[PDB]
Amino acid sequence: SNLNLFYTPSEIVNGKTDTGVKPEAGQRIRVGGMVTVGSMVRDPNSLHVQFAVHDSLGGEILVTYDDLLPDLFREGQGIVAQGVLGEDGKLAATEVLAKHD
């Protein structure tokens, strides 16, 4: 089966996907961290959407999404996104759970 585990965005930059050392494009993981106010950008297409997400670790990872996000993905909260690493540096995620409450 495909595993499922939650990891910090800032972690999964430095010496991880970006640098392709430990993880690799192919594995499914969940990024979990805080979205910055100006992070969310949608296409005029209105199906393609991408967002930067970060943590106190002071690294920002870009996540890409290829349908309409739930609640348009409201900014300035902390969500979890499940995705597979595919874009040797970016992660393709469609299962975002905004359990911020």
UniProtKB/Swiss-Prot annotation:
One of its GO terms (molecular function) is metal ion binding. One of its GO terms (cellular component) is plasma membrane. Residues 1-101 are periplasmic. Signal peptide: none annotated. GO terms for biological process: cytochrome complex assembly. It comes from the Bacteria. The keyword Iron applies. It is a single-pass type II membrane protein. Heme binds at H100. It is found in: Cell inner membrane. Keywords: Cell inner membrane, Cell membrane, Cytochrome c-type biogenesis, Heme, Iron, Membrane, Metal-binding, Signal-anchor, Transmembrane, Transmembrane helix. Its main location: membrane. Belongs to the CcmE/CycJ family. Heme chaperone required for the biogenesis of c-type cytochromes. Transiently binds heme delivered by CcmC and transfers the heme to apo-cytochromes in a process facilitated by CcmF and CcmH. This is Cytochrome c-type biogenesis protein CcmE. The chain holds residues 32 to 132 of 161 of the full protein.
